């Protein structure tokens, strides 16, 4: 096995923050469910509890950052993830055409309660848009998330 790098820990801390919307340092079923539903899934409360239980090392019913890190190491360790990123792309690509448009991005962010300004949306698209077509394809999305 390979020990987690400080760059990976930082990336995962940023990922954890997206789930931990109240910043209380834990991810609850409510928080996990909110994210899942936002990605088009329809889990039941029983399913959500089971999902947390799997990674909940201390049995307190929620996921803390250390538990999240163990989970991410496993995801990277087992095979090499990949499905995670594909399903995420599909959430953003609302019309399923293979490209995330600025409108689609803004719609997702607004739904997630992030009322981005026009300038903020433009910056997200410009930075991900390596080929310059004004939208974000799958490879560009992977590169943006893949991170170093």
């Amino acid at each position: 096995a390979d020990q987690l790098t400080e760059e990976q820990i930082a990336e995962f801390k940023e990922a954890f923050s997206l789930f931990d919307k109240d910043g209380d340092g834990t991810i609850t079923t409510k928080e996990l469910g909110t994210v899942m539903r936002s990605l088009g899934q329809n889990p039941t409360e029983a399913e959500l509890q089971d999902m947390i239980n799997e990674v909940d090392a201390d049995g307190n019913g929620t996921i803390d950052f250390p538990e999240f890190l163990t989970m991410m190491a496993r995801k990277m360790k087992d095979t090499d993830s990949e499905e995670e990123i594909r399903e995420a792309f599909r959430v953003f690509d609302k019309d399923g055409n293979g490209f995330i448009s600025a409108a689609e991005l803004r719609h997702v962010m607004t739904n997630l309660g992030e009322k981005l300004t026009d300038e903020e949306v433009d910056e997200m698209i410009r930075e991900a848009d390596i080929d310059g077509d004004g939208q974000v394809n799958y490879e560009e999305f992977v590169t943006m998330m893949t991170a170093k």
């Binding site: 990922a15 899942m36 995670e84 399903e87 995420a88 792309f89 903020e120 943006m144």
Partner: peptide, 26 residues
């Protein structure tokens, strides 16, 4: 700043916990 990453990654964590279920085929 405009990192669709924390947003994507985050969803990646949960999305991964949904697929971790190694096909409940049986």
């Amino acid at each position: 700043k405009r990192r669709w990453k924390k947003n994507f990654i985050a969803v990646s964590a949960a999305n991964r916990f949904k697929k971790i279920s190694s096909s409940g085929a049986l």
